[PDB]
């Protein structure tokens, strides 16, 4: 239930959903993350050749505004086959190839919106995703066929048409807003109608384990840099430069933040509860890491939900397995590995 009103290069991981067994169906994953802007070309290679039917997740981004994507495909690895992932991006002189080296908590609802302008190529690209905790449950893509808000989790498919109509009406409103803003921000920063620019929106609400309201968010960004955001008290704005102060004043004079507070404190919480209940078999589970040590000292963790975890040198970003679970490892060059997870009885410790 949504509202009703710089360049970073990617990090690449190539891995399987499950541990590889020669002859056993599996899933090959390429997780690209931490990059900006969102234009990226990702290929999955099999023996120096492009794999034909590769799918990918809906575009989303992290706190720092950097985007992340999961490209994946079903495959049965054998003895001779070798695999890799290729990534192109504006920050790369040539596409990078990475080979597949075979050898009790709070809750949240978050909506992510991304608009990218396409000078002289039609409307801007618009992508919207919705999350409960670390489980995405709705999406919208302007380039897609439906032109509707679409489910991405079982527990949201129960909702009837009045819900899906209202969501489709609300997302298209979020789209129009971004389209207008793209032309506006172009004007206030004196940029040409020939360049491509990105506008990102994020908002949502947190609740304790008692499902009572904890925190609320509403942030806006231009070309990967902060533009305006709601303070933690949800009653005032943070403008980032002389251009965003003009918006801050127009919004404080129209008391926009008051309508936001109501949603973030009331409506957002209310539907987060309805979702948590409707998908309790999913959202309210906790899966514990299937964990062991790899020797360079490397600590491993597989098939755990939610993604929040701590291992304590090289620490690789947590990555989706593609089945709802996540993975992570850490490395260091009389040593111990500490594993604080929100689904383990008590912290674990590991040593050779």
């Amino acid at each position: 239930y949504m509202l009703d009103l710089i360049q970073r290069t990617p990090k690449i991981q190539v891995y399987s959903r499950h541990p590889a067994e020669n002859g056993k169906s599996n899933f090959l994953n390429c997780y690209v993350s931490g990059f900006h802007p969102s234009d990226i070309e990702v290929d999955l290679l099999k023996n120096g050749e492009r794999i034909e039917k590769v799918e990918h997740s809906d575009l989303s981004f992290s706190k720092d505004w950097s985007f992340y994507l999961l490209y994946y495909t079903e495959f049965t690895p054998t003895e001779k086959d070798e695999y890799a992932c290729r990534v192109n991006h504006v920050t790369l002189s040539q596409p990078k190839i990475v080979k597949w080296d075979r050898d009790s908590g709070s809750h949240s609802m978050r909506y992510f919106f991304t608009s990218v302008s396409r000078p002289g190529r039609g409307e801007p690209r618009f992508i919207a995703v919705g999350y409960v905790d670390d489980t995405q449950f709705v999406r919208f893509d302007s380039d897609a066929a439906s032109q509707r808000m679409e489910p991405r989790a079982p527990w949201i498919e129960q909702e009837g048409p009045e819900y899906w109509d209202g969501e489709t009406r609300k997302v298209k409103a979020h789209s129009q807003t971004h389209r207008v803003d793209l032309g506006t921000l172009r004007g206030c920063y004196n940029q040409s109608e020939a360049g491509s620019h990105t506008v990102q929106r994020m908002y949502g609400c947190d609740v304790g384990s008692d499902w009572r309201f904890l925190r609320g968010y509403h942030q806006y960004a231009y070309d990967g840099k902060d533009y305006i955001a709601l303070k933690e008290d949800l009653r005032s704005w943070t403008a980032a430069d002389m251009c965003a102060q003009t918006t801050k004043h127009k919004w404080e004079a129209a008391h926009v933040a008051e309508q936001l507070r109501a949603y973030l404190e009331g409506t957002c919480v209310e539907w987060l509860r309805r979702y948590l209940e409707n998908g309790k078999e999913t959202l309210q589970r906790t899966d514990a890491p299937k964990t062991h040590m790899t020797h360079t000292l490397r600590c491993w963790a597989l098939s755990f939900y939610p993604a929040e975890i701590t291992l304590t040198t090289e620490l690789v970003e947590t990555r989706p397995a593609g089945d709802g679970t996540f993975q992570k490892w850490a490395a260091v060059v009389r040593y111990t590995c500490h594993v604080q997870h929100e689904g383990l009885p008590k912290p674990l410790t590991l040593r050779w």
Partner: nanobody
Amino acid sequence: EVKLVESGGGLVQPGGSLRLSCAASGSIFSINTMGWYRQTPGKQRDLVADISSGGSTKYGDSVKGRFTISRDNTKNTVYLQMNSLKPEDTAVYYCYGLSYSNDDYWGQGTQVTVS
């Protein structure tokens, strides 16, 4: 380990055409996909067209329909027929190839200019 010999570049009038050719050395079983990326005014190089030894092709959106890639049944050699060239196709075109172990090799490139 592999060397890529490029030819066919140069200057051409708008609306003209050019045929690029790239030939791989080494063992005939040491290269699978071959194709071309092209330099942007910026830092990156964009995909133009490539083809697997079995004939599977992929093109960059901005040359779809105008450019065609092909391969010699015998030798490891690919051909890029560029038609209806525009000034925005001016760039250095780099041939590349992939080993059957997903190792990438890259040629020196060939400047293509469209008045």
